[model samples]
Target: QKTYIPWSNGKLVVSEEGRYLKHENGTPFFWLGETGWLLPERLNRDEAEYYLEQCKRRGYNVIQVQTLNNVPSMNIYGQYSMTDGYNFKNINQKGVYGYWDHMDYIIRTAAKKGLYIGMVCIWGSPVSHGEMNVDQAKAYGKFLAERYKDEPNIIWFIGGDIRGDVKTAEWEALATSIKAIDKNHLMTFHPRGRTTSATWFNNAPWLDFNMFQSGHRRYGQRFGDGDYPIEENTEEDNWRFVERSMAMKPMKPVIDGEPIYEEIPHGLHDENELLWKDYDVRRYAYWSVFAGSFGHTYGHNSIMQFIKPGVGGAYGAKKPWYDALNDPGYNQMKYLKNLMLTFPFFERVPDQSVIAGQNGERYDRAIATRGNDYLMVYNYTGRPMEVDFSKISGAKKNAWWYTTKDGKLEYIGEFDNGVHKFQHDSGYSSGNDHVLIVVDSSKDYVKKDCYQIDTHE
Candidate 1:
């Protein structure tokens, strides 16, 4: 069996076979999926396999993982206390080689399951200057390149939100070294909050894609302004960021590497909301896809804290959250993915002008066109909206209706005294309180526009 890998005409390129990363083919690969932080530390073979299998069943083709979350010492201390100065020693208990062996096995297992692994380097900065200085970082980069150069399933991500006041020389040094060792795979940075400025990766020759940390879980602040429902601004802000990054002299692929997870403690909100909910996960997924993201990364607050079966001592257990691997939210995500697979997702483009209303909040309803005929509009709000299809001039002769949910298309038969009307069902409902409306041309036509709109803009 042969697999097709996609690339864009830009700075980063993923090989046709999806094994080696190059500079030219970074555009076409749209990785749709979630993040599993504890998959490596907590799960053994049987356990890991079961969990990953669930992800595949749920329609996820990608998994984002960090080398280490908090230092091991902090885990032992049983609190958020930072020991060993945010150094690799926390998990590099034996040495660099020891840590690599564990990570290699994890990546290999994911690859066997036909899943792409977005591998992140160390979390935060190291304790002492000697641990992660320019020279050491460079050496580490070279080591990683030499080790995974030929591995097709790996996407090398550098930095784990470790930004300092001064431009640390380590990022550049490390990136340069990786480029020298292995120029085949794509690279990007996971900058700290509110610091997704392209300047972070703009000058680096190895950067193939741009990633942003859109929402902050700890602060309860949704991306942009939380004016739109949870999923609304999160997708809007991230997509805008992608457009801005691609506009750079050397265009590249872009995605939101970190979106809200289903089951994690909500930051600064009323305790009424559960950390994990099926509706929240699905809402974010639909928004990201409809807004023209090359791909998206999902995370779980509980799993991120490394809550394993026997690891009862894991922190964040005090708060009520769903099980990492098997939970309602996880199942909902799978169902959502199944719906996405039914469409030719990769070929669709966002239709910016289809949006006709806003929820008074920041979110504006928007649409995406598949080929020429099908258009998908997401209300993105809690209430039902009357979207004007007048902008879609070519759609006049075409039939329109929701897909799959009802099985039969609700034809926009005719206008009753000039008002084009279709049967309006209850406003679309996201298990989590948001809603999505999909529109397609009654006749088959190739789609030309793909973009989102901000009515406020």
Candidate 2:
């Protein structure tokens, strides 16, 4: 009899190589995350539940949320996450039943849906606003750690997109405080655009994995943080960011915690006036994961805010946020999870050698990865590229093309030997943003159902 866990629950642990994540009991877990940045800050009870359900339905297994939402200053429940203005000891004791109580419910609710909360203790802006000095930072970390220390689904996200170089002492103190008290949970940092946790917290024991924000900008579309004008411009910059973080010592799983959100202006603001489509998000997802990150985080401008029809939001969100929940990126994510979990995920490694030519940035790039008996290549532009068969394991007998646009699978006959220019019989007239799964036919490596992820893999 064959059986596997249902992904119903557990603590997430890092794989031996520290390049992937697994459940405490050894079940494979891919972090398919969606940013509900303001989930606790904005939504009412019913609204929150609705959003969580939508996320689960669309394949997102994690929600990145901020506990201390600074933008509006309080939650929809007319509550504050902290007390008496940055007092870390109290749990919004003055408001309603208490904002912390509401938060407790949100955390548990997300866990109940088989989703982990990438809980941001506080947003970076408020830290910059002087709401949290070093004292408050350390106090806040211990406070939250002690309180939710027992929560199974909580993944502590300490730094909230601040400059990785800045707040080193404070961030370290906070992370240390949490580590001191909560040995039960895993923790990581979410540094500001273009910087990663590897830069500052790479040596910190409290820092479980690494995360960075490649951020919202693209070519001829929008500019980003800093002097280069388009410093973090291309998505290839993101792939390299993953590589840089991996090159660090004291190995840890790395993921692009935030990237260009679907539906947001490509170059950011109204200047680079072009809404990013679902394909761009798809390209980022496959590219980042294949480049060696454990998983990728998907975000949306309106959806993160839960923006309503008439109400707008940060980053030029005109449409209602909830509707953005149904965007193609959300549904497309599970396909990745399904496909990845089918392989010997723990043994997988980033193998750029499989790509014969020097991959270009953005559209022309090809990201490839391999396990013991499989090779998965992310063809970002549907453009033709050469594959060095010698880099793969065993004789690859069959290839399957995963249509990114519509969860469809196409079969490409087997091949043997040398540099082969992959020819696509793909009717993906829609576009070339696709994934090719090549496998060794001699072994029982091919999972029968593409959608059935072995919970115990």
Candidate 3:
């Protein structure tokens, strides 16, 4: 069956090439993640169950969540994560569903639905605010590992939206403490905006995969922060982060853990600023994945906080969390996941030479990737572009125009070898994106007018 259940496939491990994730039995695991950051603090048991059901139906296999929003985080039921401030010793209340007990419920519930829980141990704010020290982090990490070590769908995320360099000792202690106990599941650090985990913890023994938060900044929205890694006017270029991580030593599976979310403000503060639409999020997903990211994580302003009645929305979010799930960006993510798995998985590589001429800058750039017998080029603006077919192993190719928004494939007929020009009928526009899929004539990976991903190759 095409549907991949986490526990059924065995535990996930880094591919032998150290560039992708796969199951112990060699089933490719493409991480289609959803940001439910405040699940532990905000959602009740019933809400959590409903959210997980919706996520599974949408093809989301990994749910990234904050284990503790603060040091002594209080849930909706008023149960504290740590009963004695930073000490998780007396956390549980026997007569009730306490904070940690609720967390356990979430993990168990998600597992039943085949979703992996990305547990961000604690949000970085508390440790940055001097609420947790190295000893406390070690203690907390130990407690967490001992409790969740045996869970089949658990992935430990060390940092939470904070730079690895800040509170370095505490982060190290937390990671090492967990690694010492839980050797079953993979682990990685979630870094601050526009920074990659490779920048700080690449050499750390406990680090399993590299995660980068490309952040919510647009071209000119860096706010003059000197710590910003990438150059100017390229803030939304998430593919650059993937390439940078891949170029690093001791290569591990890299992913854009956090990107500019759907319905989020351009700079993520001013209410008047332009909110990132579905197209913007799609650009981030395609660009990064085509540049060799193992998978992509999608976020939404409302869904991340699980904002609801009486809860003030962050980042200009106005819609209810449940309502936000129906947004195009949220529904369109499954297409990307399905597209990746439909073709060959492990042997694929990003090949820019396939673009015959110079690629466009910013939104106009066309990202290309190919396996041995198939090639895919994502054109965001639907602009006419020439593709070099000599890069692939084919003289005759079966081409199709894949509509990004609706996941529909239009057969463009067969083409001979050499460079060929192609563009969508919708002309050039930001959201009128299309993927040019050219496969070797003998390959039958894609069907005519196909929209749903029914099978995996």
Candidate 4:
């Protein structure tokens, strides 16, 4: 059987230039991730395999999961993560499969299927609520690091859904402890809503990359959350976080670790609120990636929790996780990943200059990025826009309209260098997202008839 595992190249590492991730052998790593936050606690081994297989099929390379939702987190098998209150000394017992053992199974299974498990060592709530102290954090970190350090598919996420400053000492202890023992794997911090890890740990030596939760809130929906860093009416602008991290000194690759999930309520807490759909997620993925994020993460309300029968759902999730897996938002994320990998991998950079005129506001915002000889723009509303061909190294450019919904490509003939206006035939609408692909006519980077991109080759 064929597998798409990344370990075949070697362990993941930050690129020498520090702007993106690549394997030790120099293969560019496009981080298409899925938020399966409750995998450790909710999924049995069989169900875990099914979920992982679905993710792999949908082109996800990373699975972000909470290793411990609580200090004494128990798996579906009734095995506690800690045998005796954060002291992992006797965690292994005779005739017991154990909680950590189940975790090991999930990790190993995901590895076999070619996926990296982004392990959140502990959920942030417990640490903030005083359930875990620095000493316990260090001990727990050491245990986690020592156990999974050799796992090729492991990517350490130090903090969960919490601000880095809230539990600075404990987070530092946990992060440093893991780094001390585990030198092979990459690490980062997952910050709170609308906040990036760069806000606190950008300079931290242990942080290999930066991650942010662009969060679930819509435009101008702060809900009076104190200490919110983002400006009002720009809550959905995930690309801003990417651009922010890119501007920081001593650059590190960054990603929106958590974006507004599919089928999730707009502001997250209210069940009566509007739910985000596939169109919203596609916009987030394209906007962030085009704004120079290393890659993007996709989440689904029910899938994140693995909501099943008899299990109460959060954020208005009514569908079972298995059904939610097939949602358009979940499946369409692969198109964005394929598009990125289809182009020149490492040298690509976000260049808004390609948008020749004034950029649009909110959903009408057409995001742009380019490599040496090619440029692409994502038009979410299929809005007419003039693209600057001179921004790339091209005289005459062969253009194509790439559909985001199904990855179809339509040739748009060739045009001489300079500015050119493009508007998809679909007309202006919310879900009518399309990518304009233009390459130097002399180069055959994107063939005219090419539709789907097979990155594995």
Candidate number achieving the greatest TM-score relative to the actual structure: 4
> Per TM-score, what order, best first?
4, 3, 2, 1
lDDT of 2 by residue, 254-311 (tens): 9999988888876566734787778778877887888898978999888887887666
Q: Local distance difference test, per candidate?
A: 0.52, 0.76, 0.88, 0.89
Identify the candidate with maximal lDDT: 4
What is the number of residue pairs that collide in model 4? 0
Candidate order, lDDT descending: 4, 3, 2, 1
Worst 10 residues of 3 by lDDT: 448-457
Residues 1-457, candidate 3, lDDT per residue (tens digit)?
A: 3545766878888898888999889999999999999998999999999999999998899999999888688898888787676666676767877888899999999988889999999889999999889999899999999999998989999999998989999999999999999989999999998889998988788998999998698887866566557788889889998988888898888999999899888987687789899999999999989999999999999999998977878776778999998999999898898889888899999989899876788888898999889999999988779998878887799998888787887888888889999878996775888899999988788876565556332
Model 4 weakest 10-residue run by lDDT: 448-457
The residue ranges of model 2 lying beyond 4 angstroms of the native Cα positions read 1-9, 86-95, 220-236, 357-361, 426-430, 447-457
Clashes of each: 27, 4, 0, 0
Q: Quote the positional error of residue 13 for candidate 2 in Å.
A: 1.7
Residue 196 of model 4, lDDT score: 95
Assess candidate 1 and give its lDDT.
Answer: 0.52
Query: Candidate 3: RMSD over Cα atoms?
Result: 1.7
Compute the lDDT of residue 250 as modeled in candidate 3.
87
Tell me each candidate's TM-score.
0.70, 0.90, 0.96, 0.98
